[PDB]
Amino acid sequence: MQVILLDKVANLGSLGDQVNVKAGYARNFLVPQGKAVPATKKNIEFFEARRAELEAKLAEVLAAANARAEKINALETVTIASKAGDEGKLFGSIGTRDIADAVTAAGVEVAKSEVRLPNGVLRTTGEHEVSFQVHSEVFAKVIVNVVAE
Amino acid sequence: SRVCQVTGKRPVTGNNRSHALNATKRRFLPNLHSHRFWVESEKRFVTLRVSAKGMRVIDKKGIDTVLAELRARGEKY
Amino acid sequence: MKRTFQPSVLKRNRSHGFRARMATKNGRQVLARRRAKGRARLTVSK
Amino acid sequence: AVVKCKPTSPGRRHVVKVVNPELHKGKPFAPLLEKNSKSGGRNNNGRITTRHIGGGHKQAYRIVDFKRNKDGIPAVVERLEYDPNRSANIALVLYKDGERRYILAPKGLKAGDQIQSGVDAAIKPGNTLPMRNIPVGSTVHNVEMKPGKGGQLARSAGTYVQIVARDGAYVTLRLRSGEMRKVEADCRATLGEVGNAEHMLRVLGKAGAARWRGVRPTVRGTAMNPVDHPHGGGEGRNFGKHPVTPWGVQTKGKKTRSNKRTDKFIVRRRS
Amino acid sequence: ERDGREYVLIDTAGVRKRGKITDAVEKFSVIKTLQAIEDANVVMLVIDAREGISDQDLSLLGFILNSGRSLVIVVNKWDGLSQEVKEQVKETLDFRLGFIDFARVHFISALHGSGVGNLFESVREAYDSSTRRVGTSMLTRIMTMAVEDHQPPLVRGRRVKLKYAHAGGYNPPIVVIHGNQVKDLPDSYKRYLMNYFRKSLDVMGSPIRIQFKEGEN
RNA sequence: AGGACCGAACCGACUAAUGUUGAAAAAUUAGCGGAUGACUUGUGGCUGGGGGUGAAAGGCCAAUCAAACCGGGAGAUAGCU
RNA sequence: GUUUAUUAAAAACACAGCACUGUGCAAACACGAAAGUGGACGUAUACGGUGUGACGCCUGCCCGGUGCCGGAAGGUUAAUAUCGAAGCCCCGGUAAACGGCGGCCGUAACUAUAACGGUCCUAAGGUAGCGA
C-alpha cells in the first residue's frame, strides 16, 4: 500500500517520506512496527500536522536504534542500549547480560552459543564490557568495550 | 472452510472445456489462505481465513473495518 | 447346505434398530415415508 | 545364533532358525508393557489399503522411548530380551536414579554394563550423545533429525551410519544406502549399533512361518484377469504389450520424490 | 539426389519445413509422404528420444509396414540424452510390434554426427536382402519343410494342398503360392508360412509378401 | 518335535450310484481326502455397488451377480414380433 | 497347501527360496477431493512394490583409468591449395580388454584338447555343469 513513514530515518525512506511500497513489506514490517503509518488522502493530512510533534518528540531517543542495530545483526559485538545510545556512551551494568536480555535478529544468535558465567558480565562505567566468545564450551574470551551511539 | 469471510467465497461451478465443447463440470476454488492479521486494536493476531482478492480489500479499508465487521456479520471474530 | 434363513433376535434388531433408524437422516426419510404411508409395524422389531 | 534344523520332514527341510537362549524365557516387565492391535492393517474406513498386511500371531507392545533421558545418576544393564517389536533385541536397565527403563539395546551388552546418558559421556559403546561432541568418523545409530525428536532412523539390527563430517552447524552422515544427508548440529544418535546380525539368515521357510508372521499371500497380479486391475497378461498369458501400471505409466525403474523439502539435506542420493 | 541415390525430406512443420509453402492444412504434406512411399525402395524413420514414438508416430511405423519399403530406424539429436538412457524400453516397445528387418538403430545428431557411417552402411545391406535374386526353386524347397513341420490348416474335413511357390518380383519380395482357396487359409497361416521364409533365408530388408491363388479346388 | 503317518469327531467333497413332476431349489446312498494346524468352529462386530472383497475363477457379495437389490427418471425408447 | 458355494480340483491359484526395483520418514505408497487415516507405535538385514517359483546342476561380461571400435565436428599425424580429412585420441559406442569365464600350436605321458606364453583380438582362455 502506501504509508507516510513515522520512522526517523530508515535505510530507504526517511523522516515523513510518504511513498508507496510492496504490500508484503508494508503490512508486515513497515507497519505494524512504527516505522510507518498507512497513507490515505485522509491520513496524510492528519499525519502531516502530527509529524512535527511525533517524528520529533518520539524520534529523539531512537537515534540509538539505528546504531545499536548493526551490533545485533552481526552478534559479534552484541550491543544494545537498556538506557543509553542517547545518554552518551553505553555505560553501567545496564545493556545486555545482567538481565540476560539482548535483542536477537531472528532467534539464531551468537550471544548464547554457550552459557557458563556465574553472575553475567558488565560491571564497568563510562563504557560497558561485553564478553565476546572464543569457543562454544570454553570462555577464554577477548572482551571488548564497544559502544553504539 | 474455503471462504473469505468478507468477500464471500466457496468453490463455484465449472467444467474443463474444449473446443470440442464437451459436457463435464468441476467447480473452482478461490485463492484464500488463512493469514495472520494483526489487530493492533487489542494488539494481538486474530488469524482469519481470507481471499486473495480480499487480502487486498482488507488492506485498503484497514484492519478494524474488516474487524469492524464479523461482529456485524454475526460470526467468529 | 445352510439356508438363507439364519436365526437371532439380537443381530436382527441391530441390523436396524429403531433408534439407529431414528439416527441418520436418510433412513429416517424412510421412516417417515412409510409412517405416512401408514404401516403400524414401522421397524418390524417389536 | 545360527542353528540348522535337521530334516525329518519336508516342512522342516528348509527352516533355518536362530535361538535366543541369552535372554530369559518367560514373561517380562509388565508395568512397562502395553497392548498390541490388529486391524488387518485396514484404514480409517478400514480397507485393504496396502495389501497383504495383517494376521500374524498376537505379539505385544512394550512402552518404550529412546530419548536417553533421566540422564542424571547413571544405569546398568540388567537383561536383554526379545520382543517382536523390532528385528533386534531390547533390554532393561536399572538406574542408580532408582529408575527402571528399557533401552533399544546395542550389540556390546553383556549385562551389568555401565550406562550413562550424561552428555559428558564416558564414550562408552552403545551410549548416546548429541552429535556435536562425537568423535570424527564415529559409527552411530538412532538418527533423528530434529533435536530430541527421538530416533526413527537406524533402529534396526546392524543399522548404522558413519559420520562423514560435522562441519559448521550440521552433521553429515552416510545412510546405509551410500546416502549422504545432513541432520542438525545438535542432533543425537547412539554410538555404535545393536547387532542381531544373523537374523538375516533367519527364514520364513514355509507358509506356516509366514502365517505366524502375518504375511498374507502377495497375490500375483500378473496372472489375473486384467479387468479389475491391469498390468500385463491375458487369458492367453500373452506378451508383446505396453507394460504400465493403473496410473498409466511405469513404477519399476522410475524415480519418485514427493518431498521437495529434503533435497536440501541430501548431498548424494540413496542406492 | 547426391551420389545418384535419392533422399527425401517430409511431413509438415517441426521437420524444419519452413519452405515456399503449399499445405494449408495437415493434409497436403501427407500427399507428399505417400509420394515418399512411391519413390522408395528404402525409407528411414527418424524418431527422437525425448518426443519420438508419439501416438501419431507409432501409427506412422504401422503405416510403414503398409508402405512396403525397407525400414531403418534412426534416433537423431541423441548425444544430449541422459546417461541412463530412457530409451532401451522405447526400442523394446517398437521391437515387440515388431518389424523384422535389421533395425539398425542410429544414435546421431545433426549437430554432432556419430551414426553417420553406420546409417550409410545399413541401408546397403538392407537393400541386398530386399532386392535378392529369387526364384521358384528356393521357395518351394524351404516351404515343404514348413508345412510338414506345422501342418497346413484343414477346412471343413477336407485337407488342402500346396504345390509350388514363385516369385512375382523381388525388389520388395512378393511370392504367389498356388494352393487351396483364399479363405481356406486364415491370414495368419499365410503369415506363418511367410515368416518361415523370412527366417530360413535372410531378410534384413523389408517385410516380404505372400499371396495365394486357387485353381485346383 | 513336526504345514509327521493311519483314522473318529468336525469340516471338506475325489469315484460311483441314485434321484432328476425328488423325500430333498444339489440331498440321499455307497465307498473317499485332511484332521494340530496355510486347522476348525461359536458369538458378536466391521469392510458396500461402477463399490468392496478377491491364496485370482473375470469368483463371491441375502437363494439373484460378465455388473446386486430397489426406487425414480419412465405410458423410456424399439424402421422390430 | 489353496480353489471355480449351487457343472469344471488341476498341470490352475499359493508357497518358502530366489531375483529385481523403488523408497531416508512429513517415506515410498495407499485410501480419503481434504481434514484425516493406514503404511508403522515401525525404521533400509527394512518397508513397499514387482516378479520368478523348492532343491541340486547348466559358467550370468565392470566404459572409469588407459586402451580399443565405428564415426565425424575437432584434436593428433600430412602437403604447408592454408583449411588437414584417412589410421588413433575425442564424441558416442566398446570387458568373449589389462585382469576372473574359447579355440588353434607346444606342453599336465595315444602326440592332438591345456593351467603359461605365442597365434585370431591389447579374449580372459573347457577350471564349472556335462564326455563317442
Next chain:
RNA sequence: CUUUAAUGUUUGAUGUUCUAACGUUGACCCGUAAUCCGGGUUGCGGACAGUGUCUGGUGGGUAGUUUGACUGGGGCGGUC
C-alpha cells in the same frame, strides 16, 4: 532506414545473505491431574515450500461413442 555505439535508462534473470510473512509430524508452558485442538514461549526451516488461478506437455486409468454398403449365406475378395 539498415547498422552501431555512447549515454540516459527500463526491466527481468541469475548470485549471496537476511527475516518478517509462511512452514514447523522440535521442545516445553498453559486452558485441561486431555496422544485431539487451541494459545504462548523458545529451537529449527524460510520467502521458500506449498497451494489458488491461469497455463504447456502427458494421460485407455477414467468417459462417451464411432468401425458402410453391394453381396447367389456372409466375412473373405472385389467393387461403388
